[PDB]
């Protein structure tokens, strides 16, 4: 029982903090470990929190605070406030640690990526249109993506004109008792 | 991207943040396979030593869920934030 550093005297038996281990940057060496720690966390705490809880030695720590955009209490309404900033810490590990590479898009079926992607594109296209309206503009009718309902009315048009099918009056427009 | 990967210690202290060592996040179908929270009635039969060790199993378990949520969002793995909110 001999830590590589000097330990403090204030004992914390039931810490309520949540430490998030985030992926490093592409060009960073493999001895730097980035974490998201509470705003009140300091370099001495992480060094002691990483060795007594996870048994990870670190020769140095770096910390930087990330601010958050000012916003309105209710999105588009309310007083102007600012959320609590975010604190990130980068520890210099004594033993290298390399993350695994993300799975290929075709191999993420365990997370239901197919359905998730369709839903993501939908919201991406609704956020883009709501930005086109924020510029005081609209999508001309010539630029709207043809839907499945507009593609079936073009196949029928070519089937009636060609002569394959013969047009007949509609029978399900309304359920009248006269039938004439 | 084409360098020989270094050998990471199998028993590294930082492997505790990962649910699966290949994909940090756990599949939603296997992320919901948990029980229920301890009721105050069940926790009234345990000594400080058990309640002190059971506390840190939750501290390390919550860190394991925060790490997965960040990876799943950042890496666009897919769904699973509705299954973790119940686990957390």
């Amino acid at each position: 029982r001999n830590a590589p550093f000097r330990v403090g005297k204030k004992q914390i038996f039931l810490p309520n903090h949540v430490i998030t281990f985030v992926r490093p940057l592409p060009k960073q060496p493999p001895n730097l470990a980035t974490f998201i720690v509470p705003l009140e966390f300091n370099k001495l705490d992480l060094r002691d929190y990483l060795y007594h809880v996870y048994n990870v030695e670190v020769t140095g720590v770096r910390s930087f605070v990330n601010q958050r955009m000012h916003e309105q209490r209710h999105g588009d309404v309310g007083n102007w406030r600012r959320p609590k900033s975010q604190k990130m810490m980068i520890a210099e590990l004594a033993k290298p640690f390399v993350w695994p590479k993300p799975p290929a898009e075709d191999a993420r079926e365990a997370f239901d990526y197919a359905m998730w992607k369709k839903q993501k594109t939908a919201q991406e296209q609704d956020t883009k249109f709501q930005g086109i309206r924020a510029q005081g503009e609209v999508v001309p009718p010539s630029q709207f993506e043809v839907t499945k309902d507009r593609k079936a009315i073009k196949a029928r048009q070519s089937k009636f004109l060609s002569g394959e099918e013969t047009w007949a009056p509609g029978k399900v427009n309304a359920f009248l008792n006269s039938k004439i | 991207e084409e360098l020989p990967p270094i050998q990471v210690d199998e028993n590294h202290g930082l492997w505790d943040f990962f649910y699966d060592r290949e994909t940090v996040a756990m599949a939603p179908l296997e992320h919901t396979k948990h029980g229920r929270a301890w009721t105050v009635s069940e926790l009234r039969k345990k000594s400080w030593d058990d309640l002190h060790r059971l506390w840190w199993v939750c501290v390390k378990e919550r860190n394991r869920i925060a790490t997965a949520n960040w990876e799943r969002t950042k890496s666009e793995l897919g769904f699973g934030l509705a299954e973790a909110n119940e686990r957390d």
Partner: peptide
Amino acid sequence: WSLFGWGKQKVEERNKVKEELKQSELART
């Protein structure tokens, strides 16, 4: 099935609507 409720639900709830649509297509054939 809204566009902002489709991701707020667990997989079991979502995977239960696909069997509904799936079982709806077997009777149409």
